[PDB]
Amino acid sequence: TTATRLTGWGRTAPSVANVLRTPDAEMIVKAVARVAESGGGRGAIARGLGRSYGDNAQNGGGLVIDMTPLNTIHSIDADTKLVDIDAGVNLDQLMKAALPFGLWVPVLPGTRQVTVGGAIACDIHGKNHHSAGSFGNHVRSMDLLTADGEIRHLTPTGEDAELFWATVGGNGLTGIIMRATIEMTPTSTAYFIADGDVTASLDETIALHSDGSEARYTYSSAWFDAISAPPKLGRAAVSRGRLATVEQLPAKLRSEPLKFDANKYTFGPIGELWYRKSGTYRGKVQNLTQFYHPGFLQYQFVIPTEAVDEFKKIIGVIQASGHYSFLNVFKLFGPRNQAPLSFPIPGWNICVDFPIKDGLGKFVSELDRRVLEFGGRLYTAKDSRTTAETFHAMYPRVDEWISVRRKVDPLRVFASDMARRLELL
Ligand SMILES: Cc1cc2nc3c(=O)[nH]c(=O)nc-3n(C[C@H](O)[C@H](O)[C@H](O)COP(=O)(O)OP(=O)(O)OC[C@H]3O[C@@H](n4cnc5c(N)ncnc54)[C@H](O)[C@@H]3O)c2cc1C
Numbered sequence: 001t002t003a004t005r006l007t008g009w010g011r012t013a014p015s016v017a018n019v020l021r022t023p024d025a026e027m028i029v030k031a032v033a034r035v036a037e038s039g040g041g042r043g044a045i046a047r048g049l050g051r052s053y054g055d056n057a058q059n060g061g062g063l064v065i066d067m068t069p070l071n072t073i074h075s076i077d078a079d080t081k082l083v084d085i086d087a088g089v090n091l092d093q094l095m096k097a098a099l100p101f102g103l104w105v106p107v108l109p110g111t112r113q114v115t116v117g118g119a120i121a122c123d124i125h126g127k128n129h130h131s132a133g134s135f136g137n138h139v140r141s142m143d144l145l146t147a148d149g150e151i152r153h154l155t156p157t158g159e160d161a162e163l164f165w166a167t168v169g170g171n172g173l174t175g176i177i178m179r180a181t182i183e184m185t186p187t188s189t190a191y192f193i194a195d196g197d198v199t200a201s202l203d204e205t206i207a208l209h210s211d212g213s214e215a216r217y218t219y220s221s222a223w224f225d226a227i228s229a230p231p232k233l234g235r236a237a238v239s240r241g242r243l244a245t246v247e248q249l250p251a252k253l254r255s256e257p258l259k260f261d262a263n264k265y266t267f268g269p270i271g272e273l274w275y276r277k278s279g280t281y282r283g284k285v286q287n288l289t290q291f292y293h294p295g296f297l298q299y300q301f302v303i304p305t306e307a308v309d310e311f312k313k314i315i316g317v318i319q320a321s322g323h324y325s326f327l328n329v330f331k332l333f334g335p336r337n338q339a340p341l342s343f344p345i346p347g348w349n350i351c352v353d354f355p356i357k358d359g360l361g362k363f364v365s366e367l368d369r370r371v372l373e374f375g376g377r378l379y380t381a382k383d384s385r386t387t388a389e390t391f392h393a394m395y396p397r398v399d400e401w402i403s404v405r406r407k408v409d410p411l412r413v414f415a416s417d418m419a420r421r422l423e424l425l
């Protein structure tokens with residue numbers, strides 16, 4: 001145990017906590033039993049690799065259990081497609097161990113430096129959400145250490161389904177996920193076949209994503225112009241694809257198919273042509289880094305699908321705001337799952353990255369308001385400054401969730417800055 005100052009990736013909202021770090025699960029079981037006996041008393045919260053920007057993995061004046069020591073891969077099985085892994089396993093470790101079995105991590109986020117625990121607790125998503133859903137959809141079982149000190153073996157359709165789906169996306173506030181079983185996606189290669197497309201306006205970007213062409217791709221995302229004024233506003237470089245088969249690989253690659261490996265023109269018409277040519281293509285074979293991985297306030301929201309005029313209004317609001325975001329990711333989500341606090345819903349999702357400067361705070365509070373008004377929501381993994389009232393209206397099943405949480409932790413053994421800020425205890 002060590003008094004430490006914790007922050008999310010965005011290095012904001014620091015608090016000091018007693019960070020327990022042990023590879024012995026039993027010591028984690030005791031640590032919880034010591035907290036549950038001494039009242040709530042600021043409680044405890046699990047931490048993974050600290051990739052949430054927010055305050056969901058910190059607990060000012062309480063216990064923070066570092067789960068990364070507990071990183072044993074117990075088994076992988078290519079016939080069942082199941083991996084059995086401790087919660088502190090990360091998706092890069094997992095991805096590399098699973099490939100020799102013909103198995104693919106079913107949901108990968110923009111970084112592979114996240115733990116399995118954090119992937120479940122934030123119910124993370126990726127470029128294949130419209131074809132695969134989020135991470136919780138592929139969990140077949142997890143062992144949850146609850147406030148009573150018992151370890152419950154939960155399944156998605158068992159008798160404890162309710163607690164299972166409260167843990168999916170429950171930012172650790174139902175207990176510590178010790179271990180889980182995931183169903184992987186079968187693959188014969190570590191490569192993608194990608195199609196690329198460049199649009200010139202927001203209206204075209206929208207139109208490309210509503211042709212029906214998204215149904216031909218399992219992975220899809222886009223880089224998104226949020227600075228340029230209309231008509232350029234919302235032009236995008238779209239990148240869509242599928243996991244390749246061995247047959248579609250070049251000869252050089254079919255022997256190890258599963259192995260993991262002019263500036264004055266830029267803003268002128270010649271730059272426009274180059275960007276469009278380089279960004280337009282078909283059938284390009286790419287490994288994971290090339291396909292998936294090509295001071296600040298990180299902000300992410302989704303607008304339900306039908307509300308397209310509303311989504312266009314929000315992009316216009318951002319462009320006229322005087323806050324310039326260069327690194328913006330756009331994607332059309334597909335169906336949601338049954339976790340009450342799961343962030344993804346079918347509709348228009350986008351991430352923006354704002355330089356911290358005067359007026360930004362108040363401008364993002366207004367963004368919150370328009371996002372809420374238009375039926376959307378923010379992502380806890382990206383947030384540390386929204387209000388409980390805003391969050392509770394964005395998430396109309398919160399009360400349903402809070403009820404489950406109070407049954408399993410009546411003494412508030414599990415707690416985080418986020419839970420206090422967002423009124424989730
Ligand atoms: C560069 C970057 C790109 C990202 N891209 C994406 C993306 O494409 N899609 C997406 O959905 N997210 C994305 N994220 C967010 C990230 O995937 C999530 O925040 C994820 O939860 C981080 O995992 P972690 O192990 O770092 O968890 P932490 O940040 O350490 O913790 C996050 C939450 O998980 C809980 N938790 C962790 N381990 C356990 C456990 N064993 N038991 C119970 N609760 C636990 C914590 O209590 C906390 O509530 C990105 C983040 C960054 C920095």
Ligand SMILES: O=[NH+]c1cc(C(F)(F)F)cc2c(=O)nc(N3CCN(S(=O)(=O)C4CCCCC4)CC3)sc12
Pocket residue numbers: 109110111125126127128220221222292294300327329330331349350351352
């Ligand atoms: O956040 N919302 C997202 C939503 C999706 C979705 F919807 F498709 F699923 C996908 C992604 C993704 O795939 N990757 C992301 N990253 C964030 C930061 N960086 S960086 O910009 O590359 C780098 C920063 C510092 C130096 C300069 C460049 C690394 C990657 S975010 C993201």
